[PDB]
Amino acid sequence: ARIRHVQGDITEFQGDAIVNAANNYLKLGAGVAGAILRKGGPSIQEECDRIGKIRVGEAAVTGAGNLPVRYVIHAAVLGDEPASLETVRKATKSALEKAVELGLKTVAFTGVGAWVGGLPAEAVYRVMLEEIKKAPDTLEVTGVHGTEKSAEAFRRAGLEHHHH
């Protein structure tokens, strides 16, 4: 799938869904997850609670409440077990699978938060970007970034390496 990177606020992304790095208990925590909770409103956590525990590496779909998207895709990267490059790979793949199942055309993710935590960012971004490449071209993926340092780190992890 095609990926584009912008500076912005993922809670203001207009499109079909946003992907939220999650714990496998679907308990919305600090930072961006907290903005999702506040802007989306209580229906998001209420639905997460109804879904219950999922597997680490799985992704669960909820409504998005008052957010300008139709869904939040909660990609479980940690919880029962700590985050690893492997759980990151599985979760990104699972999130993209849900987008395909739901027939989505535009989805956003962000590079901060639980995707990285105690992992090396560059390696995480490379793993995510590999999974995003496999996704169908009918799907447009936007990376929404807090800062510019973040966005170009993503463009760098995205460039193909050729002889000089």
As a whole number of Å, the CA-based R_g of the chain is: 15
Q: Which residues, other chains included, contact 19 with Cβ-Cβ below 8 Å and sequence gap of 6+? A: 59, 72, 73, 75, 95, 107, 108, 109
User: H helices of 57-120, where?
Assistant: 85-101
Angle at 91 between CA 83 and CA 68, to 5 degrees: 115
Solved with? X-ray
Distance CA 88, CA 71 (A): 20
Nearest to 79 by CA among 52, 98, 97: 52
Task: List C-alpha distances in Å: 138 to 10, 67, 95, 109, 141.
Answer: 21, 23, 15, 17, 10
Beta partners for residue 7, in sequence order: 145
Q: Tell me the resolution in Å.
A: 1.9
Alpha-carbon distance of 135 to 154, in angstroms, equals: 18
> Nearest 5°: phi and psi at 146?
-65, -45
User: Beta partners for 23?
Assistant: 78
Which top CATH class is 1-164? alpha beta
Half-sphere exposure of 117 (CA within 13 A, CB side): 16
Q: CA 146 to CA 160: how far, in whole Å?
A: 24
